[PDB]
Amino acid sequence: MAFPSGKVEGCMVQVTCGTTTLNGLWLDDVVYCPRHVICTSEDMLNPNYEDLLIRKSNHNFLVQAGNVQLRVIGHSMQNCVLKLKVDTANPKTPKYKFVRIQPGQTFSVLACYNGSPSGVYQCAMRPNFTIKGSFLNGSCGSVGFNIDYDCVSFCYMHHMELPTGVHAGTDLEGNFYGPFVDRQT
């Protein structure tokens, strides 16, 4: 059994940088997404993220909530997450907190594609910090959460599928669960 997803659906956006696109989480006036978005196809194998960050300006990020483009007015990098400051606060921001979970704990995942919610299901973090999720291409940036009364606890942001078909990602401060790095190897 997963938690009802309504409170999280209203926070999902699409983030595009050049030709690279994925999902972002829009809370108050900040959009959180995997920093992998600043890679072109050539960069994805061995990215130098500090150097790519320097090359990008605010107007190189295209953030879309449905059909509405949001203006990016600042950007910063925190571990493996990018934080995009936008000029509009999300009117559907629920009460929320960020938390880091442990192996054995379960959470709900809202799988999204190109900024649009697609399905909801429950996962468990395995002892080696991977999860056996149900994720296809385009799902990078999908989030996992629990509901604690009126409060949404965001605990997981999806980054990558590993060669054996399990999945790996970060907490909402950009720190990986497990000994992984955000590169296409």
Next chain:
Amino acid sequence: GTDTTLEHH
């Protein structure tokens, strides 16, 4: 020096 990566919607 400006990034010239083509944007695709």
